[PDB]
Design a protein. Structure first.
Ligand code: SF4
Ligand code: SF4
Ligand code: F3S
Ligand SMILES: [Mg+2]
Lengths: 533, 265
């Protein structure tokens, strides 16, 4: 078994530019470093600009989690100027965000994560009749042998061309000891990967119905939204049809596949756990009360879910000691600093362009596992029902959630819960219009001096944008992004970040093809343009 | 089947919104594009291989005797000898300098790759440049498909034209295809009769905005922006002004600095 270093650079099937370094001893990871290798400096660029312009710049933090930063910046400036947006603006903003979750998580599972678990080439060996019986046993949607043979025939032609394209040099080519699925399950997953390529077009289109376009929506303003056409029955019906189809795919395709893969990889309940969790809540009734959100905020330390702590936004500090910025002083983001200073890999013990956010000094996982576990522990009835059903189907106890497998399952749970909740929000929105409320934007005034903060729980977790307005301009603007929490480096107390800590203990069967490292890293759904900005 | 043309897709200083836009391809869809039309031989967002295996896949594609087309997303950071952006511990400037002169054709996809984009906005701490600007000394002349992100119709149409004709289509003075970028957004806009009548919405909350009046007083950059947004739309369904929001000028060079404040004209 292997002892020595392993470097994965680039980590593919993420957003952005990540280098993972590990030290392996006798076949298990004993140390890890998360190195983000692109900086853009959007916070520097924003200084001095009109606060109304911020959302347009910050949306370009990330086009995978598109919309989320426009929403965070608009919430931030809304908050700074003290505007209470109309009910319909909250509904429309919430509906577009719900649609973003569905798009993002579907694409993550199939197009980013699944090639760590699915040997596409082994699908060529499959018996399509057996595969169809399996597929039809796990879903109410019935699949026939001919349906899957059509996929197998297309794949065969592609592989026999010799041009493997995105599968070139895959870790599974020729077989790999860490790839466990049978040919039939590989064929089912491959068929659904291909189906998801077309389904995600619809899921993204749902955002454009109200939000102009995807990627990079263009319907938010300080004070509300601009899309008067979103009040019309025709646009609402268009959104509703796309949502319904997307939800059917979640319920009938994604969740069953997630469960069939998780059952085959149950050993992955043993790896990739973390200690502490933070979440901001999402889908407000009241833009100024996080506790009015469908998912509520909370903080948990050392897996102590009986003692959820309230979220105190003043307990966030972003460290730079192990990052490529000047000095070593952590800052709260209303006093944030973005002062690049590169020292190369491990120069002066610095190894990333991400800052290292800490909450009360602790490294915090954020994202679906945090949102799901915290909501479960707050008694959220929909999250409890789906989570319990998933654990029962897999035949595991709640402890299994603290793992790479658990995190992957939580992403599915979140998707299912949000898919259902979008229908509730949609009905509430219709009901509001029917009462005669046709207002979508409220007037406001720019203060010369103000502070503001906006909170979004994005697909990867707790996103916050922080503004200091001075002379009516951007004095300071700081983004603290979910992947910054999860994938940032060590802090000035030398505490490993969640991704780094989670990698300790990872087995590596073949150091040339370290798929186990990818499985854990991908389970966090890294977004490095987000983390660094 | 016939050999499919090889595409090497590079990611520099980018947000991945351009990659995501390609996933939105419609008739043809992205599955058809990568199974039938093209061979997508390197693409960090979706490729199976990682690390050394991904680097080897890149080398295999670039050195193929069959040739390749490069599609490039993101600006190239040039400050401090390129160190603000690295892949496999090589600067993006070095990677693009080595690869792009070997391509049979280069397409710069998105305003970042074409013109420098969001990270090139003042004060441009990373010294980000568009592809042609960064690599002019090497003779690279990428076809520029602008927008933040562009319409994926425009990428697919350019690729199809090149494969059929073995040449770039007619290009404008910013190296953008005239078949997509030959008209202003504004001359194509449904609100143009209101513009002509001097019927401007004074605020987003106004009855005039509700009635679909022109967004020029609220900052619309349609009159100074070349793109096909009102014609093709996005996602087969909408575009900014039809969603009630001004155009921000996102297919134009330097738009982050030239078109701001976004809510003024
Ligand atoms: S052009 Fe816009 S959407 Fe494309 S990579 Fe640049 S910032 Fe992102
Ligand atoms: S809304 Fe914009 S693009 Fe349309 S007519 Fe007015 S200025 Fe022109
Ligand atoms: S902002 Fe961009 S997407 Fe079209 S409408 Fe204006 S050129
Ligand atoms: Mg920041």
């Amino acid at each position: 078994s292997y002892s020595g270093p392993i470097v994965v650079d680039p980590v593919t099937r993420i957003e952005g530019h990540l280098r993972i370094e590990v030290e392996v001893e006798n076949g298990k990871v004993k140390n890890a470093y998360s190195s983000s290798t692109l900086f853009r400096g959007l916070e520097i660029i924003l200084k001095g600009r009109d606060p109304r312009d911020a959302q347009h710049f910050t949306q370009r933090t990330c086009g995978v989690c598109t919309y989320t930063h426009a929403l965070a910046s608009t919430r931030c400036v809304d908050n700074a100027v003290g505007v209470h947006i109309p009910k319909n603006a909250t509904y429309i903003r919430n509906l577009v965000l719900g649609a973003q979750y569905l798009h993002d998580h579907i694409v993550h599972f199939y197009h980013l994560h699944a090639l760590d678990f699915v040997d596409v080439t082994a699908a060529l060996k499959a018996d399509p009749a057996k595969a169809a019986k399996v597929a039809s046993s796990i879903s109410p949607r019935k699949t026939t042998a001919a349906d899957l043979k059509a996929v197998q025939d297309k794949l065969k032609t592609f592989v026999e061309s010799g041009q493997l394209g995105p599968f070139t040099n895959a870790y599974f080519l020729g077989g790999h000891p860490a790839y466990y699925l049978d040919p039939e399950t590989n064929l089912i997953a491959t068929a659904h990967y291909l189906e998801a390529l077309r389904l995600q077009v619809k899921a993204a289109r749902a955002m454009a119905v109200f939000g102009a376009k995807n990627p990079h929506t263009q319907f938010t303003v300080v004070g509300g939204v601009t899309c008067y056409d979103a009040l019309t029955p025709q646009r609402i019906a268009e959104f509703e049809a796309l949502w319904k189809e997307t939800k059917a795919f979640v319920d009938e395709v994604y969740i069953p596949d997630l469960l069939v893969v998780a059952a085959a990889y149950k050993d992955w309940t043993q790896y990739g756990g973390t200690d502490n969790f933070i979440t901001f809540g999402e889908f407000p009734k009241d833009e100024y009360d996080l506790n009015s959100r469908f998912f509520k905020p909370g903080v948990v330390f050392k897996r102590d879910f009986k003692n959820i702590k309230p979220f105190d936004k003043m307990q966030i500090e972003e460290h730079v000691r192990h990052s490529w910025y000047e000095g070593a002083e952590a800052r709260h983001p209303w006093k944030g600093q973005t002062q690049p200073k590169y020292t190369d890999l491990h120069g002066d013990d610095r190894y990333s362009w991400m800052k290292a956010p800490r909450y009360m000094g602790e490294p915090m996982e954020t994202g679906p596992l945090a949102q799901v576990l915290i909501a479960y522990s707050q008694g959220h009835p929909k999250v409890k029902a789906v989570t319990d059903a998933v654990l029962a189907k897999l035949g595991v106890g709640p402890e299994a959630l603290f793992s790479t497998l658990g995190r992957t399952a939580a992403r599915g749970i979140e998707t299912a819960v949000i898919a259902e909740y979008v229908g509730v929000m949609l009905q509430e929105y219709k009901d509001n219009i029917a009462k005669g409320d046709n207002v979508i934007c409220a007037p406001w005034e720019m203060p010369k001096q103000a502070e503001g903060v906006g909170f979004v729980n994005a697909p990867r977790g707790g996103l916050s944008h922080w503004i200091r307005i001075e002379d009516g301009k951007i004095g300071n603007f700081q983004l603290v992004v979910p992947s910054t929490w999860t994938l940032g480096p060590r802090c000035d107390k030398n505490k490993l970040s969640p991704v780094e800590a989670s990698l300790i203990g990872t087995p590596v069967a073949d150091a040339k093809r370290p798929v186990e490292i990818l499985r854990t890293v991908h389970s966090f759904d890294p977004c490095i343009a987000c983390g660094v900005h | 089947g016939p050999r499919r043309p090889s595409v090497v897709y590079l990611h520099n200083a980018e947000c991945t919104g351009c990659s995501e836009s390609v996933l939105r391809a419609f008739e043809p869809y992205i599955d058809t594009l990568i199974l039938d039309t093209l061979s997508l031989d390197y693409h960090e967002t979706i490729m199976a291989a990682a690390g050394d295996a991904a680097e080897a896949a890149l080398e295999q594609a670039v050195n193929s005797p069959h040739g390749f087309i490069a599609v490039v997303e993101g600006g190239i950071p040039t400050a401090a000898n390129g160190i603000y952006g690295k892949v496999a511990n090589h600067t993006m400037l070095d990677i693009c300098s080595r690869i792009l002169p070997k391509a049979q054709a280069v397409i710069a996809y998105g305003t970042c790759a074409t013109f420098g984009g969001v990270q090139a906005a003042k004060p441009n701490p990373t010294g980000a440049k568009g592809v042609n600007d960064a690599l002019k000394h090497l003779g690279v002349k990428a076809i520029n498909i602008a927008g933040c992100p562009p319409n994926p119709y425009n990428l697919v149409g350019t690729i199809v034209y090149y494969l059929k004709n073995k040449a770039a289509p007619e290009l404008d003075s910013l190296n953008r295809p005239t078949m997509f970028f030959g008209q202003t957004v504004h001359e194509q806009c449904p609100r143009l009769p209101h513009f002509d009548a001097g019927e401007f919405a004074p605020s987003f909350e106004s009855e005039e905005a509700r009635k679909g009046w022109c967004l020029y007083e609220l900052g619309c950059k349609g009159p100074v922006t070349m793109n096909n947004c009102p014609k093709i739309k996005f996602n087969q369904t909408n575009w900014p002004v039809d969603a009630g929001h001004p155009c921000i000028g996102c297919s134009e060079p330097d738009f982050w600095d030239a078109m701001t404040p976004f809510y003024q004209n």
